[PDB]
Amino acid sequence: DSQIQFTRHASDVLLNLNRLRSRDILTDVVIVVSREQFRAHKTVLMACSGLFYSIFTDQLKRNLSVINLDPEINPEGFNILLDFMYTSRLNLREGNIMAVMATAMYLQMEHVVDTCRKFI
Amino acid sequence: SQIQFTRHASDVLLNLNRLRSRDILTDVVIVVSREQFRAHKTVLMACSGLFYSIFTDQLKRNLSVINLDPEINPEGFNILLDFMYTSRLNLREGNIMAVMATAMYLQMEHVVDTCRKFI
Amino acid sequence: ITTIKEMGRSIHEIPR
Amino acid sequence: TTIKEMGRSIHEIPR
Ligand code: NA
Ligand code: NA
C-alpha cells in the first residue's frame, strides 16, 4: 500500500477559501465591529477562534448570521486577525500591535497573543 | 512585519476535518450509489472543479442532497473525500483505478496525475 | 506502507 | 520583514 502526502494541499485549500470569501461565496455570517462589517465562513472562524467556536457550537446560537462584537473591539485589529485566519500571515505595525493583541485575546486566539507579545 | 505561520493552513484543515467528523456546520450530503457522505460545500468547492460548478449553479446550489453519477464508486469517493480533508491520499492496487476514475469525474487532475505514477 | 510527499499543487485554483 | 513561526497557530478542536 501507499500514501501520498500533498504538502501544500492545506495551503491551497485555505487560499481557495479566501477566494470564496473575497467573492462572498457561501459566506454565512457578518461580524459587525462598531462601524465596520466583515463577512466570513463560520467554519473558518470556529477553526481559528475559541470565541467563535463556543458561539457556533451553542445550539441556540449556531444559526446566528450576524454577530455584534463588544463595542470596545478595534475594527482594524479584527480585520488583521480575519486576514490571518484566511492566509496564515499576521501583518503587524507599530501603531496597531496593541490593538491586534487585545483583539486576539478577546477572540481567544492564544497562540497569536503569544506571538504579538514578542513584538512589544 | 509579517509573521508567516507555516503550519496554520494544516491546523485549519485538521479543525475542518474535526468539524466534519462531529457533523458541525455541514451543509450537504453526497450520495454515491445509496452511500451517504456529509461534508462542507466550501471544502468540496475548494478541492473539486465539479463541486465548484455544482455549488455555483443556480439550479443546484441550494440543494442539500447531491447525487453523483450512478457509475461512481463509493470507496473511491471516500478516499478522495478523506484526501480533501487531510492532504493524505491512500492508494491500494485493488482500488487505484477506481480512485483515479473518481478523481477524473470530480475534475481533480493533479490527483489523477499522481495516481498515474503508481500504475 | 510507502509514504511519499508530493510538493506540487494538489487542487484547482479558484479565481479572484 | 518576514518571520517564520513553526508552532501551532490556533486551538485544536477536539474529536
Ligand atoms: Na463552510
Ligand atoms: Na446523514
Author numbering:
A (entry chain A): 6 to 125
B (entry chain B): 7 to 125
C (entry chain C): 1341 to 1356
D (entry chain D): 1342 to 1356
From the reporting publication:
Here, we report the functionalization of the BTB (bric à-brac, tramtrack and broad complex) domain from the transcriptional repressor BCL6 to serve as a promiscuous assembly block that may assist the crystallization of a guest protein. The 129-residue BCL6 BTB domain forms a symmetrical strand-exchanged homodimer that contains two lateral grooves that bind corepressors with high affinity. We showed that these can mediate the formation of a variety of highly porous lattices, and that a guest protein may be incorporated into a BTB-domain lattice by its genetic fusion to a corepressor peptide that binds to the lateral groove of the BTB domain with high affinity.
We next sought to adapt the BTB domain to form an assembly that might act as a crystallographic scaffold for hosting a guest protein of interest.
